[PDB]
Design an enzyme around this catalytic site. Structure first.
Site, PDB file in Angstrom:
ATOM      1  N   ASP A   1       8.416 -31.796 -12.316  1.00  0.00           N
ATOM      2  CA  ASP A   1       7.249 -32.065 -11.433  1.00  0.00           C
ATOM      3  C   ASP A   1       6.613 -33.402 -11.842  1.00  0.00           C
ATOM      4  OD1 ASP A   1       7.666 -29.695 -10.014  1.00  0.00           O
ATOM      5  OD2 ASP A   1       5.735 -28.787 -10.534  1.00  0.00           O
TER       6      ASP A   1
ATOM      7  N   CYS B   1      15.019 -37.322  -1.058  1.00  0.00           N
ATOM      8  CA  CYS B   1      14.023 -36.628  -1.903  1.00  0.00           C
ATOM      9  C   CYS B   1      12.825 -36.331  -0.999  1.00  0.00           C
ATOM     10  CB  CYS B   1      13.790 -37.452  -3.175  1.00  0.00           C
ATOM     11  SG  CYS B   1      13.450 -39.234  -2.908  1.00  0.00           S
TER      12      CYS B   1
ATOM     13  N   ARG C   1      13.650 -40.924  -6.500  1.00  0.00           N
ATOM     14  CA  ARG C   1      14.847 -40.218  -7.037  1.00  0.00           C
ATOM     15  C   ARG C   1      16.099 -40.667  -6.270  1.00  0.00           C
ATOM     16  NH1 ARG C   1      11.979 -34.206  -7.236  1.00  0.00           N
ATOM     17  NH2 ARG C   1      10.056 -34.973  -8.247  1.00  0.00           N
ATOM     18  N   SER C   2      15.995 -40.775  -4.960  1.00  0.00           N
ATOM     19  CA  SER C   2      17.107 -41.213  -4.068  1.00  0.00           C
ATOM     20  C   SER C   2      17.618 -42.591  -4.506  1.00  0.00           C
ATOM     21  CB  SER C   2      16.655 -41.243  -2.607  1.00  0.00           C
ATOM     22  OG  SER C   2      16.434 -39.926  -2.078  1.00  0.00           O
TER      23      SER C   2
ATOM     24  N   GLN D   1      10.420 -46.087  -7.689  1.00  0.00           N
ATOM     25  CA  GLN D   1       8.947 -46.036  -7.378  1.00  0.00           C
ATOM     26  C   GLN D   1       8.060 -46.337  -8.606  1.00  0.00           C
ATOM     27  OE1 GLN D   1       9.095 -42.080  -5.192  1.00  0.00           O
ATOM     28  NE2 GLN D   1       7.387 -43.060  -4.140  1.00  0.00           N
TER      29      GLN D   1
END
Ligand code: B0G
EC number: 3.1.3.48
Length: 282
Positions: A181, A215, A221-222, A262
């Site tokens: 998370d 994602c 994450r992608s 990100q």
């Protein structure tokens, strides 16, 4: 410069935030005019994440061809990826239309449907064999065929039927279920195994359409998944693997979709994965 040494130099100097901002400053800026049309407001999860017009995936319909999805075409690596947001309640039919039209074999999902107590994407695939899903807006049927649940990822076999022609195809769903998370994984071992198993399936290979990767926003994450895959493929292909420059590969990929990677922590994790990945290969 051997990236393993570039890595220890940035870590000892604690300059991850500084490298990351340099990438943000040099990244491409292209128009996204179709994404911002008022007719498309409920097709976008996030106001600040849009596909560029030049690389957007077009749906094969005259009504409205728009989906929040980009084609990343890596010329030297000879790999293509579609990166997309997690589907919304009103875009689940568009999502499967895209998979059908682009001839994809594989869908890679890097998020959970709920994270931090909020919905990060729609429940867009069936959870039981005997309860199939029909998407009336795009005329598709989706059936769960089998499910293999492992400690760090689940692999599902899905059947997608074009109800218009009665053609069917097998789609593989690769679901990475353990990204935490908060922050990034401590070790890249389970993320690398997951990438190996997507590769082993044929889903990334040139005999199929591009893999669909998502994602929640389809950039963080992608971004990490496609950046790691392309950097390791280039190390295999070139005479001098030391020549592979992860920052230059990331800026090439940012010509096709904004915002890939990100955070400074996602940039450090991408280095670790490629490096820890390079370790195992030798
Ligand atoms: O994590 C691994 O290695 C790093 C790596 C993965 C994918 C592409 C390039 C490098 N796997 C899992 C274990 C399997 O035996 C094969 C390797």
């Amino acid at each position: 410069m051997e990236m393993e040494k570039e890595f220890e130099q940035i870590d000892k100097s604690g300059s991850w935030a500084a490298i990351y901002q340099d990438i943000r400053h040099e990244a491409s800026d292209f128009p996204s005019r179709v994404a911002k049309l008022p007719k498309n407001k409920n097709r976008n999860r996030y106001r600040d994440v849009s596909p560029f017009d030049h690389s957007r995936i077009k749906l094969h319909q005259e009504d409205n061809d728009y989906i929040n999805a980009s084609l990343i075409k890596m010329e030297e690596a000879q790999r293509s990826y579609i990166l997309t947001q997690g589907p919304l309640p009103n875009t689940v039919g568009h999502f499967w239309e895209m998979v059908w039209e682009q001839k994809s074999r594989g869908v890679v999902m890097l998020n959970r449907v709920m994270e931090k107590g909020s919905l990060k994407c729609a429940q867009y695939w069936p959870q039981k064999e005997e309860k199939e899903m029909i998407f009336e807006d795009t005329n598709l049927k989706l059936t769960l065929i089998s499910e293999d649940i492992k400690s760090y990822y689940t692999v599902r076999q899905l059947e997608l039927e074009n109800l218009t022609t009665q053609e069917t195809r097998e789609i593989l769903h690769f679901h990475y279920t353990t990204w935490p998370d908060f922050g990034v994984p401590e070790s890249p071992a389970s993320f690398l195994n997951f990438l190996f198993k997507v590769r082993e399936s044929g889903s990334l290979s040139p005999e199929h359409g591009p893999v669909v990767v998502h994602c929640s926003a389809g950039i963080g994450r992608s971004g990490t998944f496609c950046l790691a895959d392309t950097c390791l493929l280039l190390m295999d292909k070139r005479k001098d693997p030391s020549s592979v420059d992860i920052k230059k590969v990331l800026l090439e990929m940012r010509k096709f979709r904004m915002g890939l990677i990100q955070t400074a922590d996602q940039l450090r994790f991408s280095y670790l994965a490629v490096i820890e990945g390079a370790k195992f290969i030798m």
